[PDB]
Amino acid sequence: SVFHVLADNNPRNIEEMFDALQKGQIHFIEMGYEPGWAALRRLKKILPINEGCSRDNFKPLISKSIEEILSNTGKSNQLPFPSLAILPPIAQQWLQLPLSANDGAWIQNLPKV
Amino acid sequence: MSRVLLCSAGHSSMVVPEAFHAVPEGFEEVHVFTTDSEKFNPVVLNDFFHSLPNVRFSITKCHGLADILNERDFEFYQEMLWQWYLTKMPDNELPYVCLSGGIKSMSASLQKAATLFGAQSVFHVLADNNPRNIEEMFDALQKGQIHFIEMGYEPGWAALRRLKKILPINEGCSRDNFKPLISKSIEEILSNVKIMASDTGKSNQLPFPSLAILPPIAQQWLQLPLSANDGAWIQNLPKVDLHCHLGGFATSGSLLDQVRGAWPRSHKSISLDKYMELGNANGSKLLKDKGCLIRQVELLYQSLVNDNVAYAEIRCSPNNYADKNKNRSAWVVLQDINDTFTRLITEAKQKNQFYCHVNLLVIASRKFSGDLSDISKHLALAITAMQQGEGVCRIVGVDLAGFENKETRASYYEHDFKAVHRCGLAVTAHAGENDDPEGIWQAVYSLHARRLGHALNLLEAPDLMRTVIERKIGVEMCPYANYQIKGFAPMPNFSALYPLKKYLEAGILVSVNTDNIGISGANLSENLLILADLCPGISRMDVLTIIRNSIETAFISHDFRMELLKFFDRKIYDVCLISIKN
Amino acid sequence: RLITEAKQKNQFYCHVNLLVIASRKFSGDLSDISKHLALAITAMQQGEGVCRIVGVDLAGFENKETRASYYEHDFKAVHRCGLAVTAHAGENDDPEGIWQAVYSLHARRLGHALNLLEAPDLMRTVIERKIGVEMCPYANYQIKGFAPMPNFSALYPLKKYLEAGILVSVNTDNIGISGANLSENLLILADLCPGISRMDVLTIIRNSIETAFISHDFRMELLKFFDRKIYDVCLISIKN
Amino acid sequence: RLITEAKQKNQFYCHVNLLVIASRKFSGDLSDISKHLALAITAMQQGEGVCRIVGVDLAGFENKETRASYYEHDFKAVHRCGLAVTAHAGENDDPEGIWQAVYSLHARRLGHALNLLEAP
Ligand SMILES: Nc1ncnc2c1ncn2[C@@H]1O[C@H](COP(=O)(O)OP(=O)(O)OP(=O)(O)O)[C@@H](O)[C@H]1O
Ligand SMILES: [Mg+2]
Ligand SMILES: [Mg+2]
C-alpha cells in the first residue's frame, strides 16, 4: 500500500503532531493497492549488496527495457493465450524484445510441444 | 505529429513555459490542469502563448475544490484529472507530461495517470533561481541554468486507454450526481489482476475471441444466456456475413420500387421453388441494364454498412446478368460490379468512417440440362477475374451452388476443379439439403471444399463430424433459411432441435449467415436474434465465438485476416465496455 | 502406465501419442507399406485408452525412389478411416511432390519443407489451408547448413515463414543423434534467425498446439492448461 | 480498329485473328497453363467484334521431357467451350507423341512435323 500523509499546519515538534492526530487533523490519502510485478526481485540475488561501489558501476538493467518499450501489426496482435492480456505491460514489452542466448532458464521453464 | 503537453500548476504558473522551452524542438498542443483557486495567474501564460498563435493552448478548471484537504477532495481531484488526461490524450499518440508543477498530491496523481494511460516521456524541470517572469527564465536558459530531468517511459494499459468512449452522457461530472467511472476502471483492473493471481480454476482462460480485461461483472453478464432484449447490444456488435446473394436484395418493397425506377417471420414450411419465385421480380429479368445493377450494388453496400457488418463475401451470377444484345458480356458485368464496390469502399474509407469490405464469389450455377460448358465458362471467368490483382475488392472463391441433389454431386467435375485449385482459388460447396453423408464426404475430399454450405444433418454421421472437425472446414449454417424452409423448435409442428448448439459444442467452425436478406426479410442481426428461441440456453460468449469462427473461416490473406482481427477485437472490447454500463 | 502413474501422484506428466512410420523402399517389397497402414488403423481401432495412435507418417530417403505420389490408392482406406498423414515432403523435394502430398494425400503436415520460399503458389495455398510445417532447427542446420555456418551464405527461413503466416512448429527429430532437446532447439533460433522475438516463440508453441491431431475437447483442456502455465512462467520470468 | 479503318476506305485489308500460345514452361509455376486456358476461353466468350480469338496453341521446349502426353486432362474445358486446338510437335520428337496429340488433345493442326515420312 502506497499512500500520502497531509498535515494542515505541518507540525514540527512531536507533541504537536500527537495533538493533531488526537483530534484527527492528519488525513490519509492512498490511490489503492499496487500489485507491482509478481516477480522481479532476482535482481537482488544476481546483484550483491555492493556496499563498496560508486557511480562507475551503474546498472541500467531495466532502463533499456524501458527504453525499448515503444521505441521499437503482426507483433501487435499476434498475441496468443488470451490471459497474456492480463499480464502487466512491462513484461509484455519484455516479450516484445528480441530473443537472446541468456534466456535459457525461461526456455527450460517454458511448457513446450 | 501533435506533441501534446499536459501539466498541472499550483501557486507557480511560469513552469509551463519552462516545460515548453525545455525541448527546443517545440511542442504543438499544451494543456494545464488547475483547480479554481484564486492564487492562479493565468494572464502571464495567456500572453506568453498568444505570442505563438501556431501552438494550441487551453485551460481547464476543476470547479468546487480550492485545495485538497480530505479524502473526498482528493478523490474528486483524481477523478477529474484522470478524465481530463484521458479526454485530452491524442487519438493515436502518447502525449508528453511534466510533473514539476503542483503540490505533491497532484504530482503523484499525475504520475499515476501517466502510468495507467501511457505517455511518450514523463519529465521534470529544475530552476536554479526559480524565476517568476519570462525574461529572467529566458536569461537563465540562455546561460544554461535551465535543467530538465527525465526518468520515465510508460506504455500504459491499452485496455484502460480504450475507455474514452464512455466519457459522454455525464454532463461534466457535477458533484451532486457524479459517479467516478475512472474509479470503476481502476477497480476493474485491480479486481481482474487479483482474481487472476488468487485462483487457478478461474485463471484457466475462457475467452478465446480475446479480451480478458473486461470487468468481472461484464464477464458474468457475457456468460449468462442471451435474451431477446440484447438486440441493441448485438446490433452495435460488428458482424461478418460470408454467404449473401446479390440477386436477392430488392425482391420486394420500396427498395425494389426504387431500384426498378433507376414474412419475415413465417411459421409454415416453404418449398425452394416458392422461395426462388419470391425474388423473381429481380435478377435475370431486371438487372440486365446497367443502372438497375449499379443501384442494387449501392443499396446493398449501404444496407451492409448500416448493419455494422465489417466484412462480407457476395455470391453473384455474372452470366445471369449479361446481355449480348446490348454488348453486355458476363465479364463486363463482373467488372462493373467490382468497380462499383471498389468505388464505394474507397469513398467510405477516405472519409475515415466505418466501412464494409466486400469480396465476390463467382457461383458456378447448376443446370445439368443444357449447355454444360457453362460451368467451364464460369470457372474460366472466375480465374481471369481473380487474376486482376489490383483493387481492394477482388475474387477469392467459387460457389458450387444449385440443386444439390444426387444428380449433381461432387463426383462429376473434380478433374475440372483441378484447374481452379491450381491457381490458388478457394472453392465453396453446397450439399446441405436432401443429401447423403457419402456426398458430403467426397465433396470435402475430392472437390477439396475449403468451406461447406449448410449440411444440417451432420449429427447422424459421426465419421463425417470427425472429418469436418479435424480438417477445420467451416459450415455455412443459415438460421432463418432453414427456419422458413425446414423449420425447427419451438414452432408448431416443428419439434426438431436446431443442431447449431450441438455443432458449437462439438467444435465445428459454424458461421451464421443471412443467405438472402431481401427474400427472407431478416438481416444478420435478426439471424443472430432468432437463436434465442431457436436454440435455448445459448449465451453471448457463443455468439462471440461464432463471430470468431466466421472471421477465421473467410477466404482472406493472412495479413488482411490479421488487420480484421485487430479491428474486431478493438471494436468488440469498446462495444462491450459501452453496453455493460448502460 | 507411465502417464497414469505420473497423473495419480498429481505431478507434471507429458501426454504422448504415437505415429506409425510407413517408410518407402526401406526393407524390400512395398507391401510393407500396406502392412503398416493396416496395423496402424487396427491399432487406432482399440477404442479405449489414454496414449492413442493419432495417425500415420510418410518418410523416404531423398526423392524419386521415395516420391510422395505413388501410394494414393493404398492410402484411400486408411485416410478414410479417420487417421492423419504427415508426409515428409521436403529436404530437397521439388514443389510438385509437395503439391501432390497436400492435395491428393490430404497430408495435414509437411516435414521440413525448407525450400518452400521458392514456390509462391505453393506457399499461398499452404498458408491459405494452415498446413503445419514441422521444422527441426538443429537437425537441418547440421545436415544442410545455414548462417552463421562457416563458408556458408544461405540463412534459415523460419523468420519469413512466421511472418508469412505458416503454422510452423519447432521439433527435435532425433534427440540422441543431433544431441539437442527442445529447449536448446528453440534457444538456437536467436543465433540462427536474428531478430526473433519472444512472442514469436509463444506463437510457435500456439501453432504446435494448433496443428496437433487431437480431439476438440482435449485441445480445449490443453489450451487452458498451457495458457495458465504460460502466464505463470512469464510472471516469474522477468524476475531474472 | 485497323481492319475497320482499312475496310471503310474500301482498300485491301488483311483479316487477322489471334492464337493464344500456351507456353510449355517446363516447370515455370505450371498453373500458367490453366491461366492461359481460362484467359483464352473468356476472350472467346467476349464474342462481339471483327477480330476474334479462334484457338490455342501449345509449343516450346520441344524435347521429349515436355511432350504432349501430360496435359491431356486440362484440355477438356477449352475443347468443350468451343475453342480450337493446335499442337506443335514433330520437329525432333517421336512418332507417337503426334498420335497422342491427334487422338487425345483433338488437335486440328500439327506444327512442322517434318519427320512424318517415316511413320506410314
Ligand atoms: N478493416 C477495417 N474495417 C472496418 N473499419 C476499419 C478497418 N480498419 C480501420 N477501420 C476504421 O478506423 C477507424 C479508427 O477509428 P478510432 O480508432 O479513432 O475509434 P473511434 O473513431 O472513436 O470509433 P469507430 O471505431 O467507430 O470509428 C474506425 O472507425 C474503423 O471504421
Ligand atoms: Mg444461398
Ligand atoms: Mg524425421
Residue numbers in the entry:
A (entry chain A): 121 to 192, 200 to 240
B (entry chain B): 1 to 262, 281 to 600
C (entry chain A): 361 to 600
D (entry chain E): 361 to 480
Authors' text:
In order to identify novel CARF effectors, we used Foldseek18 to search for proteins with structural homology to CARF domain of the Cam1 effector. This method rendered a 600-residue protein containing an N-terminal CARF domain followed by a linker region and a C-terminal adenosine deaminase (ADA) domain, with accession number HAJ98955.1 from an unknown Bacteriodales bacterium (hereafter named CRISPR-associated deaminase, CRISPR-associated adenosine deaminase 1 [Cad1]), for which homologs were already identified in a previous bioinformatic screen. cad1 is located immediately downstream the cas10-csm genes of a type III-A CRISPR locus. Further analysis of cad1 homologs showed that over 70% associate in genomes containing type III systems (mostly belonging to the A and B subtypes) and exist within many unique phyla of bacteria. These data suggest that Cad1 is a widespread effector in type III CRISPR-Cas systems. Altogether, these data demonstrate that Cad1 deaminates ATP molecules to ITP through the formation of an hexameric complex that requires a Mg+2 or Mn+2 cofactor and an activating cA4 or cA6 ligand. While the triggering of a growth arrest in the host is a common strategy of all CARF effectors, we believe that Cad1 introduces a new mode of defense for CRISPR-Cas systems that couples nucleotide deamination activity to a sequence-specific, RNA-guided adaptive immune response.
Given that ATP is the putative substrate of Cad1, we obtained cryo-EM structures in the presence of this molecule and found two different conformations with either symmetric (3.4 Å resolution) or asymmetric (3.6 Å resolution) positioning of three ATPs. In both cases, one ATP molecule was bound per Cad1 dimer, unexpectedly not in the deaminase domain (inset with red border) but within a closed (not the open) inter-domain pocket lined with amino acid side chains belonging to both the CARF and ADA domains. We wondered whether this mode of ATP binding was important for Cad1 activity, and therefore, we mutated the basic residues shown to interact with this molecule in the solved structures (inset). In all cases, we made aspartate substitutions to change the charge of these residues and found that while K584D, R588D, K164D, and R162D did not affect Cad1 activation in staphylococci, K589D (within the deaminase domain), R161D, and K165D (within the CARF domain) prevented a complete growth arrest. Third, we unexpectedly found ATPs bound in inter-domain pockets between the CARF and deaminase domains, with three ATPs (anti-glycosidic bonds) in apo-Cad1 hexamer increasing to six ATPs (syn-glycosidic bonds) in the ligand-containing complex. This observation suggests that ATP binding to non-deaminase inter-domain pockets impacts the activation of the deaminase active site. The structures of individual ATP-bound Cad1 dimers (in a hexameric context) in the absence and presence of cA4 did not exhibit major conformational changes between states.
